[PDB]
């Protein structure tokens, strides 16, 4: 068995998504993709079936699959599995549209809700589409516009050609999400392949992509931000375990995503961790070797108590 | 078998919730309540067990139960049932904390996710705690503050003694949520009884509590609002079914809650419906009798296309 790679496509509504979704559903791009979305529009349908849980599953002419969703995403996920195993449909990538006002959080959690889903589906990454022209206005008005960026493993920034100076926006995206690289497509369309193989849900040693700079006045502009913590000292495995558990429990409803690499006292291998809201996990990785040991952590969330968080880790110092 | 009454406690953080949560877990109030929350604080624990799904379940001195939760709410819900049926714990009410930045949406959906949950648990209502002093600022800054109010079946407005004439606030809450009655909590503690027995998730014929008035300028202050639709004409059951389905599909990520009573052409009984986001249901109810037939519907959501919605129902006119 090979796990189905799941991509979440998020961002505020725009014509850019439509062009991308149209390409997936219509062209002969060679990908075997199942798409879950609210509306599909004018698409060439080969066949159509209804799952045991009432999921409307259409097989398209290009070989891809278009599946509707109800309020329970589990039902679509399970109906897709049933019909895959029955040989009714064939796919190895799942793309879920969660644009507009959708919160990527509950969608991610669905994939960890049941053992069958944990085994048969494997989250690839969260892709955030960002319109350079309207992003600032959208993020100022709606918290969720920032949250979608905060959940992202990869940010696709479009329309910078017409928006003008993109850097002010580039800096804001980095303050919100210090994890995710920002891809700025100036000429041409978004390549479909840029949605895939982000490795966003694997343990990483390089948890920060855009190293934070010093801009105190503008750093407190967003409600969702990244806290980057760097330690040049090792910590006790029992102690840091307590700190994390207290931290995560304290800001449970505030935390979107968080990842880290830890220098553990007396241990020659890196300790990596990652989490989404309440769900977190950790494991050992590459040995330090000749590389200088250190800890790097990034916490992305809303109204996080940065002061307390930094103090908590500071107290781990002997 | 008799379903456990479930109360969702939401609203922005404060000492009011804290006192309320402290009161539930500590005082001898005569209620048999299980509480799911992130933090419980210092509470006198009688006994403690770990569920099969790793849920930490504590029995308190006042007879109440304190249960922890992970990222998967189902785990706690199922573990509570297991230990209830085994005779390890006893309760007939469940209170779930979803205050702060928490979204009541995914929590509500959990209770419809599986048959066992649908049969053993019965969602009674969503209670929104509102701080009269800080509510305006919070709702201006955070969409989720408005959303929590929009999901409510009952609104508890506290601290009006120090806020003063919170009449302006009354109107704003009513604009956001035309469904939910507002109770002004007098100086001091929120009484436990105010959380219970709303019957918020049953089909209702009296869907609107605060019948909307004309405040054209103020009606544009909020991102979440209620659309109240009144029809003095019967509609075709197939046609209004089409209108609703298109409406729901168009604003799927925007709709928080909606309820209605419908006058159906040729049918002597009221048709009642209710929904939360994508999940909706309808059934026939009390005959019209000598009472004048009419339709009343309320739609609560963010950036709803009121114009299109009203046009859609207008088009159902013969
Ligand atoms: Zn489930
Ligand atoms: Zn009033
Ligand atoms: Zn008084």
From Swiss-Prot, chains A, B:
Catalysed transformations (reactions): GTP + H2O = GDP + phosphate + H(+)
Pfam families: cobW (PF02492), CobW_C (PF07683)
Binding site for Zn(2+) 4: 167, 170, 187
One annotated GO biological process: DNA damage response
EC nos: 3.6.5.-
Binding-site residues for Zn(2+) 1, renumbered to this chain: 37, 42, 66
Positions with a binding annotation for GTP: 11-19, 161
Domain of life where this protein originates: Bacteria
Notes on how activity is controlled: GTPase activity is inhibited by metal binding. Activity is decreased in the presence of Co(II) or Ni(II), and is completely inhibited in the presence of Zn(II).
Chain's role: Zinc chaperone that directly transfers zinc cofactor to target proteins, thereby activating them. Zinc is transferred from the CXCC motif in the GTPase domain to the zinc binding site in target proteins in a process requiring GTP hydrolysis.
Family: Belongs to the SIMIBI class G3E GTPase family. ZNG1 subfamily.
PANTHER family per record: COBW DOMAIN-CONTAINING PROTEIN (PTHR13748:SF62), COBW-RELATED (PTHR13748)
Subunit structure: Monomer in the apo form. Metal binding induces oligomerization. Forms homodimers and higher oligomers.
Stated name of the protein: Zinc chaperone YjiA
Species of the source: Escherichia coli (strain K12)
Gene: yjiA
């Amino acid at each position: 068995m090979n796990p189905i790679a799941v991509t979440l496509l998020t961002g505020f509504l725009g014509a850019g998504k439509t062009t991308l979704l149209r390409h997936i559903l219509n062209e002969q791009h060679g990908y075997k993709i199942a798409v879950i979305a609210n509306e599909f529009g004018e698409v060439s349908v080969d066949d159509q079936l209804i799952g045991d849980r009432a999921t409307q599953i259409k097989t398209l002419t290009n070989g891809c699959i278009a599946a509707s969703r109800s309020n329970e995403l589990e039902d679509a996920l399970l109906d897709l599995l049933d019909n895959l195993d029955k040989g009714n449909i064939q796919f190895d990538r799942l793309v879920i549209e969660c644009t507009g006002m959708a919160d990527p959080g509950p969608i991610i959690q669905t994939f960890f809700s049941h053992e069958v889903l944990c085994q048969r589906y494997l989250l690839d990454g969260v892709i955030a589409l960002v319109d350079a022209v309207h992003a600032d206005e959208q993020m100022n008005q709606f918290t969720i516009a920032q949250s979608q960026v905060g959940y992202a493993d990869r940010i696709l920034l479009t329309k910078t050609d017409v928006a003008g100076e993109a850097e002010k926006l580039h800096e804001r995206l980095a303050r919100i999400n210090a994890r995710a690289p920002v891809y700025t497509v100036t000429h041409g369309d978004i390549d479909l392949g840029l949605l895939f193989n982000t490795n966003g849900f694997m343990l990483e040693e390089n948890v920060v992509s855009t190293k934070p700079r010093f801009h105190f006045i503008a750093d407190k502009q967003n409600d969702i931000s990244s806290i980057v913590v760097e330690l040049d000292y090792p910590v006790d495995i029992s102690e840091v375990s307590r700190v994390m558990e207290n931290l995560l429990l304290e800001s449970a409803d505030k935390l979107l995503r968080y990842k880290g690499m830890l220098w553990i006292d007396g241990e020659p291998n890196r300790l990596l961790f990652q989490g989404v809201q309440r769900l977190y996990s950790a494991d050992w990785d590459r040995p330090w070797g000749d590389e200088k040991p250190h800890s790097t952590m990034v916490f992305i969330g809303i109204q996080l108590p940065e002061e307390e968080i930094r103090a908590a880790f500071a107290g781990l110092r002997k």
